[PDB]
Amino acid sequence: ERPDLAWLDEVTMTQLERNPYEVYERLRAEAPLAFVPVLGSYVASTAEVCREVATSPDFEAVITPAGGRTFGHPAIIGVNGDIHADLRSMVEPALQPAEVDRWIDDLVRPIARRYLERFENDGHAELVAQYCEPVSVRSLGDLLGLQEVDSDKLREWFAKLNRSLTNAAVDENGEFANPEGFAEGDQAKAEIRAVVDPLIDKWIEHPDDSAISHWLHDGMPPGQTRDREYIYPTIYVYLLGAMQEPGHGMASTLVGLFSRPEQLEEVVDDPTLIPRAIAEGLRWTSPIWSATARISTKPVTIAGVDLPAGTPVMLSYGSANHDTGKYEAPSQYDLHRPPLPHLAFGAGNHACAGIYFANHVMRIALEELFEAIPNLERDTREGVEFWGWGFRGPTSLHVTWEV
Ligand code: HEM
Ligand SMILES: COc1ccccc1O
């Protein structure tokens, strides 16, 4: 236990969920790599340390304790070596930029229009539930082969998987403080299996262009498929972050633009600025804020801490994206911030595989939104509330517009 960080003993899980930024501002200044008692783990808070751990030859992927309870094995985020290579080879084809460009417009734009058509004449909406999350999950759901799973269900699953994977609080002995907080995740996985098992049954016999059918068949000997147990954890990885994050990215971007009304106006008038707006939104409130981790594979010194082999380090990329070593006034959304590298997609061998896809999903969603509702205003009756330490995003985004 590090004496000058005794105050970390009093940091609570709820505090980190409500707003982790004050604690992490202290961490970035005091201890870029610091053992946080309630999390039971070292956490990397600065860009330099997060990038170093994520790319180091002396680290490899590890799933967090709560992530492991949520996804099991072999979750693509938590494995290495040959299994990771296979799972990356499995997911990467549909995510290849040239492939995404072939169909992303015809995938996402009709979906965005569909959800827009339900409310664009109302003069008010709650964009997280009515637009950002449905576009995000409907787009990926259709890509995966889950066309028949309604957006409400996909959204419920990622919400439950989120809370399960981020159920990280531990007591003084390192045991989960809230062991009952995984049951809901277990329930969501049971539901998912009930839906996806017959789809897999079908895809084994009748492959199609769905991503999950390709996960079963691609690269396999004739007549063989990857075992469903082998791919289910990566399905869960998708049904959490891949479903959740584009929607949170677009919503956080809107919140940031609303916080800079002149920049909102600039982006509406010039939608070519939407990619920049999104990249700044992801830096400003990173959707994957501290969900993943790495484990040292040999003794290594990181930020002056001599870590034994086998030491987990949580990658709080959301804090790294407020590193004042890199950014001026990082808590302020600023479209006109110089484009600098950011860590919202992680780094290294286990960096986000779906960056190009995700950026286009968010781009197209905001393009259609601003075209349909160019006079969007935030419902300033209250502030926007953001929630989450592992994954972070606005819980709601009430807007209005003159009809
Ligand atoms: C704005 C949206 C998204 C953000 C901010 C995001 C961010 C991230 C981050 C931070 C990680 C962990 C990287 C690390 O630990 O170093 C990750 C992993 C991953 N993401 Fe993305 N993600 C997004 C959307 C998506 C989508 C839509 C997909 C799939 C279509 C996807 C697929 C993956 C995969 C497969 C991994 C695991 C990579 C590995 O462990 O090898 N992501 N993502
Ligand atoms: C792409 O989905 C994830 C990424 C990182 C951690 C958990 C996830 O479900």
Side-chain angles (χ1 to χ4, degrees), residues 58 70-71 83 104 116 141 184 254-255 269 278 303-304 318 323 333 337 348 352 370 379-380 395 402:
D58 294 332
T70 302
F71 292 156
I83 287 168
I104 190 70
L116 249 1
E184 183 176 66
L254 293 160
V255 173
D269 162 277
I278 285 161
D323 199 321
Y333 179 94
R337 187 176 303 283
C352 183
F370 294 149
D379 195 328
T380 65
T395 61
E402 321 280 356

Side-chain angles (χ1 to χ4, degrees), residues 76-77 84 88 242 245 288 292 294 317 344 346-347 350 352 362:
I76 192 166
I77 63 176
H84 185 243
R88 290 292 296 226
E245 295 334 306
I288 296 190
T292 59
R294 303 294 192 275
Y317 288 133
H350 271 88
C352 183
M362 296 184 283

Side-chain angles (χ1 to χ4, degrees), residues 173-319:
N173 283 123
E175 298 180 56
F176 286 119
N178 179 30
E180 319 83 352
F182 300 115
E184 183 176 66
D186 291 352
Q187 204 265 318
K189 286 173 284 184
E191 293 193 2
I192 287 165
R193 289 241 190 171
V195 167
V196 174
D197 274 349
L199 294 183
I200 287 178
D201 290 343
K202 166 192 77 178
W203 285 325
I204 288 172
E205 305 299 323
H206 306 279
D208 62 13
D209 45 8
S210 76
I212 296 172
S213 173
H214 279 285
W215 296 4
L216 292 158
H217 292 275
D218 281 1
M220 300 294 298
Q224 300 183 21
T225 51
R226 294 187 175 73
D227 192 87
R228 68 191 69 206
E229 298 311 323
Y230 176 84
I231 73 170
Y232 256 126
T234 295
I235 294 177
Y236 303 151
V237 170
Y238 269 56
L239 290 182
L240 166 39
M243 291 285 170
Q244 180 172 246
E245 295 334 306
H248 284 190
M250 45 187 111
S252 287
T253 295
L254 293 160
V255 173
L257 290 166
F258 281 131
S259 80
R260 306 294 303 274
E262 70 280 4
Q263 301 188 348
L264 173 67
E265 185 184 338
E266 199 180 345
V267 171
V268 166
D269 162 277
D270 188 358
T272 70
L273 299 177
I274 278 166
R276 180 82 205 102
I278 285 161
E280 168 63 357
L282 295 186
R283 180 212 64 76
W284 174 68
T285 309
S286 302
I288 296 190
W289 207 94
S290 197
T292 59
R294 303 294 192 275
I295 185 167
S296 61
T297 51
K298 64 186 269 210
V300 60
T301 296
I302 299 294
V305 188
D306 298 334
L307 302 177
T311 303
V313 174
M314 281 168 181
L315 295 169
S316 303
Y317 288 133
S319 166

Side-chain angles (χ1 to χ4, degrees), residues 255 258 378-380 382-386 394-398:
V255 173
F258 281 131
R378 200 177 76 73
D379 195 328
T380 65
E382 330 167 34
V384 177
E385 149 180 353
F386 284 81
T395 61
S396 78
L397 178 44
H398 295 274

